[PDB]
Design a protein around this ligand. Structure first.
Ligand SMILES: [Mg+2]
Ligand SMILES: [Mg+2]
Ligand SMILES: [Mg+2]
Ligand SMILES: [Mg+2]
Ligand SMILES: [Mg+2]
Ligand SMILES: [Mg+2]
Ligand SMILES: [Mg+2]
Ligand SMILES: [Mg+2]
Ligand SMILES: [Mg+2]
Ligand SMILES: [Mg+2]
Ligand SMILES: [Mg+2]
Ligand SMILES: [Mg+2]
Ligand SMILES: [Mg+2]
Ligand SMILES: [Mg+2]
Ligand SMILES: [Mg+2]
Ligand SMILES: [Mg+2]
Ligand SMILES: [Mg+2]
Ligand SMILES: [Mg+2]
Ligand SMILES: [Mg+2]
Ligand SMILES: [Mg+2]
Ligand SMILES: [Mg+2]
Ligand SMILES: [Mg+2]
Ligand SMILES: [Mg+2]
Ligand SMILES: [Mg+2]
Ligand SMILES: [Mg+2]
Ligand SMILES: [Mg+2]
Ligand SMILES: [Mg+2]
Ligand SMILES: [Mg+2]
Ligand SMILES: [Mg+2]
Ligand SMILES: [Mg+2]
Ligand SMILES: [Mg+2]
Ligand SMILES: [Mg+2]
Ligand SMILES: [Mg+2]
Ligand SMILES: [Mg+2]
Lengths: 205, 50, 262, 151
RNA sequence: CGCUACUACCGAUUGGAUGGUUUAGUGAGGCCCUCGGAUCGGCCCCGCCGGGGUCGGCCCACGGCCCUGGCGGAGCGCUGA
RNA sequence: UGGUGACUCUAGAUAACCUCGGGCCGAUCGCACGCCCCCCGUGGCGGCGACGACCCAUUCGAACGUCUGCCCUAUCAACUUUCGAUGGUAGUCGCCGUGCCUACCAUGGUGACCACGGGUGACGGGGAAUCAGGGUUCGAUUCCGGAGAGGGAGCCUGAGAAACGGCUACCACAUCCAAGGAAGGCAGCAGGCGCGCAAAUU
RNA sequence: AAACUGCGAAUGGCUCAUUAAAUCAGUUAUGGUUCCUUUGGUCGCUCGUACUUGGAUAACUGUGGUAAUUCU
């Protein structure tokens, strides 16, 4: 079937070589796992040695990490925006390694508001719900307020991430291979890399 | 056309050879596992389901 | 081939088994075990060819299935079991104990030992690594893994193992001036004292050894097994103390023995 | 800017450059810590690798490669591919019947790291063996020594 | 130059021939993906046979609440293969 | 913590995840049977083995790589790159490293030191014959590697096969048939036909 | 006995058609992988009916089809 051998290739000098054996089992290849966005669907593959490969065919959630805050959370995947290898992968919404996707921001916002006790992602209109009010304006003692006020010294986020939180969606990069392990894991883009990919996305439009 | 009939409650089998189109009309155009009324077979099978 | 091979031609067998050519087409292929195929001695070869207890391969099986043979204190019924260097073979029916030690010709010898000596063996440290929960592990030349070894024990050292409990009693460090035996190459079976070690980064190290008579030779670091500290071995040695004679002096000794015979 | 020339972001995988810090430490300098390693066997790390800013995953000093095997030498003959050059190795083959020799040569395509600059055609190069980096490349440039005509 | 024979060469022309390549047009069969759902179960709704407890009017009768073994019929109800 | 010439090694810490086509964390078997209690029980404890299992190490390997090395032929002097040829970046696939494949890029790579093409009554070596000293010729053949099972191709199972005394098709042959169907692979041991100068017992 | 389950059947034996940096030989590497089995090490390290849980299938007993199969 699909063979990934080296003896069907031309030589370095440019001359072609005559094979000396037929296709072997250990040189096989398999059709690509074009992973889309949707309700989870994963198929297992029996591979050499009796081991398993998880062939993800459909995925909708994955755990991503906010590196600067060291906050890893499980969030749903919304859309695919950029792909360095090919732009056809963006049009068909295929999940591969190193592709740029949009993920939800709610769990990160919850952790930020529960840790620093500061608003984040809220509109200037200041509309509020009592649960959020008691999360932010809870009655704490002197010692606990002393820790929270000290934490408020380091509570500062760049304008790009703040605007993304206002929009409700964050930009992330997938670091795992969905077609091999069956899961889509990655990290939240920030810093110079975020500016680079924002410039690339804007130039693509 | 032969019919191999089994009664599971007693666990008794019997092979009956039927040469009649009328008795076999009710079985035609039927798929497997379907329930039929075996009245056309004769007077013995009044109320039997096969 | 499409998989593992299960036979061994008699002419392709190791030459230190001293098999003859006309007995058959095949040789006993050693089973997988603590020792390598080319560096072991199958139980059948030792039981019928060396000791002359059995005449055929069927009698070896008849002896083994009576659970008479013990290797390192454990009963082995496999007749192709790979027995290797510094192994102890016990036969309680006849009350005999043997230790597999190379002679100066590079062949395993029938070396009888005291039953007191049969309680321990020497092993060469092959690997040191830290496992889960920060627990040190030591791996020897005969596939033994020991947990919590002494922190001073490193690779290329020698440890004394008590066969009943399988625990380290003491050890010998790899230093110049210690006693060693060669376990491979052209100098296989020789005994001497380490003189110096040559280090070649990215390649094999070379160790120089000098015997009791003053003859010097060299081997690779992987072919050296530390036997004793200083000049004193920690095990009993065979008839030849590890000194290799030249052909001329072997002839002289043989002629002297013949003249005094009769 | 000059480093970012591909469709994908070029980064050193083992360096985390998004560590947040106070506003006082941001003003000082935006100087990423460089990742480099000693390759062993007595070879020294070029100062351009430690102080440089290039990104190369196949570099022996700042990339993910391992040098093990044979250490060979050659003369640079062609520099026309991207980050890889062609060197020539000359030798003599002995013919037993005539008790004489004949001149022979081999060509090697080897990887050249950006840390080595001012490399000209005709200077001596010491290369080390690594895993196959491409179809025809199995060696990496470790040292460069200039020709006899250096002024 | 005239007799007698052989081998090797050209070359009207097209046959018996096979073998090896490829341009285009079809293309068996397996494998992968997206569908499909013959059929086989389990869970709910009733009914009558049967065994454990308890509750009620209670005296060897009959219902309530749970379980428990089988049997017959529905629901394009749910679910699994 | 420990190690290497060299780790993006081993070990440690933190935040999460953990696939329904689903990782482990024993509902398995035999032989001898005994000590203990406010006890006669729901009685409690106990010795050797057999089988199984996640993960390390070892053994037997296998698979990809490095350097050097092969017979004639120029009446074969330029070849490769549309359909990957040489290299770069990111991916897919694969047990892994890699134009193995894909997308976007650069214009590369090889060659009188004989590339490319063609031929071989070419499987390669350990070896054999002849030989003063050089050398010439042979090696299908019992040992070590490779390949194949009439020719191609595609697979299931399994740790391991693109297996053929396994399966599925096409191509060429070919067996039984009640014409509806069913079954094939001796370059395994004998043996038969054919071929030939040329080779043994069902 | 038969049958279910487990293992082996990828070894051995034969031949030399293909194959000209290919195979192969010596020398190195896997710090770039997989590995049945043997040997050794782990196997109360998880803080969340059990005095042993469930439904089937052969062998067997009976009824059959086809000219024909290690068909069913
Ligand atoms: Mg072939
Ligand atoms: Mg074979
Ligand atoms: Mg064996
Ligand atoms: Mg000469
Ligand atoms: Mg098809
Ligand atoms: Mg770690
Ligand atoms: Mg790559
Ligand atoms: Mg590439
Ligand atoms: Mg040939
Ligand atoms: Mg030849
Ligand atoms: Mg000569
Ligand atoms: Mg001569
Ligand atoms: Mg030969
Ligand atoms: Mg040969
Ligand atoms: Mg021939
Ligand atoms: Mg052979
Ligand atoms: Mg084959
Ligand atoms: Mg054949
Ligand atoms: Mg044939
Ligand atoms: Mg065939
Ligand atoms: Mg198996
Ligand atoms: Mg085949
Ligand atoms: Mg056959
Ligand atoms: Mg076979
Ligand atoms: Mg025959
Ligand atoms: Mg036959
Ligand atoms: Mg003859
Ligand atoms: Mg004949
Ligand atoms: Mg069976
Ligand atoms: Mg098997
Ligand atoms: Mg034979
Ligand atoms: Mg080789
Ligand atoms: Mg690898
Ligand atoms: Mg194993």
């Amino acid at each position: 079937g699909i063979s990934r051998d080296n003896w069907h290739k031309r030589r370095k000098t440019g001359g072609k070589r005559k094979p000396y054996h037929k296709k072997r089992k250990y040189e096989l290849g398999r059709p690509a796992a074009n992973t889309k966005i949707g309700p989870r669907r994963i198929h297992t593959v029996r591979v050499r040695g009796g081991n398993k490969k998880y062939r993800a065919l459909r995925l909708d959630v994955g755990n991503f990490s906010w590196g600067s805050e060291c906050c890893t959370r499980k969030t749903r995947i919304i859309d695919v925006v950029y792909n360095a290898s090919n732009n056809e992968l963006v049009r068909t919404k295929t999940l591969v390694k190193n592709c740029i996707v949009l993920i939800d921001s709610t769990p990160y916002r919850q952790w930020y508001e529960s840790h620093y006790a500061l608003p984040l992602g809220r509109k200037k209109g200041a509309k509020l719900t009592p649960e959020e009010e008691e999360i932010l304006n809870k009655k704490r003692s002197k010692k606990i307020q002393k820790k929270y006020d000290e934490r408020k010294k380091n509570a500062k986020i760049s304008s790009l991430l703040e605007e993304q939180f206002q929009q409700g969606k964050l930009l992330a990069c997938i670091a795992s291979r969905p077609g091999q392990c069956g899961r889509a894991d990655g990290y939240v883009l920030e810093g110079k890399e975020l500016e680079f990919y924002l410039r690339k996305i804007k130039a693509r439009k | 056309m032969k019919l191999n009939i089994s009664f599971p409650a007693t666990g008794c089998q019997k092979l009956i050879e039927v040469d009649d189109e009328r008795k076999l009309r009710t079985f035609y155009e039927k798929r497997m596992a379907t329930e039929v009324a075996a009245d056309a077979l004769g007077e013995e099978w009044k109320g039997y389901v096969v | 081939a499409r998989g593992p091979k299960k036979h061994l031609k008699r002419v392709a067998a190791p030459k230190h088994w001293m098999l003859d050519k006309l007995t058959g087409v095949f040789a006993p292929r050693p089973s997988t075990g603590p020792h390598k195929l080319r560096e072991c001695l199958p139980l059948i070869i030792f039981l019928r060819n060396r000791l002359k207890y059995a005449l055929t391969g069927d009698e070896v099986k008849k002896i083994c299935m009576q659970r008479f043979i013990k290797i390192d204190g454990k009963v082995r019924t496999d007749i192709t079991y790979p027995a290797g260097f510094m192994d102890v073979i016990s036969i309680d029916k006849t009350g005999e104990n043997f230790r597999l030690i190379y002679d100066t010709k590079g062949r395993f010898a029938v070396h009888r030992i005291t039953p007191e000596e049969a309680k321990y063996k020497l092993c060469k440290v092959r690997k040191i690594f830290v496992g889960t929960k920060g627990i040190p592990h030591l791996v020897t030349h005969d596939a033994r893994t020991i947990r919590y070894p002494d922190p001073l024990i490193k690779v290329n050292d020698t440890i004394q193992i008590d066969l009943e409990t399988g625990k380290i009693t003491d050890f010998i460090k790899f230093d110049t001036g210690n006693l060693c035996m060669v376990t491979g190459g052209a100098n296989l079976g020789r005994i001497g004292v380490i003189t110096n070690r040559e280090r070649h980064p990215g390649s094999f190290d070379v160790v120089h050894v000098k015997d009791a008579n003053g003859n010097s030779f060299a081997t690779r670091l992987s072919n050296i097994f530390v036997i004793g500290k200083g000049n004193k071995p920690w095990i009993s040695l065979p008839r030849g103390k590890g000194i290799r004679l030249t052909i001329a002096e072997e002839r002289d000794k043989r002629l002297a023995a013949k003249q005094s015979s009769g | 800017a000059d480093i970012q020339t591909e469709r994908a972001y070029q980064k050193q995988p083992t360096i985390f450059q998004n560590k947040k810090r106070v506003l006082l430490g941001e003003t000082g300098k935006e100087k990423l810590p460089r990742y480099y390693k000693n390759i062993g066997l007595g070879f020294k790390t070029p100062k351009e690798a430690i102080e440089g800013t290039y990104i190369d995953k196949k570099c022996p000093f700042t990339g993910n490669v391992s040098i093990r095997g044979r250490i060979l030498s050659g003369v640079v003959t062609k520099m026309k591919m991207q980050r890889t050059i062609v060197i020539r190795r000359d030798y003599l083959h002995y013919i037993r019947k005539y008790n004489r020799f004949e001149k022979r040569h081999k060509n090697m395509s080897v990887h050249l790291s950006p840390c080595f600059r001012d490399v000209q055609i005709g200077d001596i190069v010491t290369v080390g063996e690594c895993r196959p980096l491409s179809k025809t490349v199995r060696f990496n440039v470790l040292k460069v020594t200039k020709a006899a005509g250096t002024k």
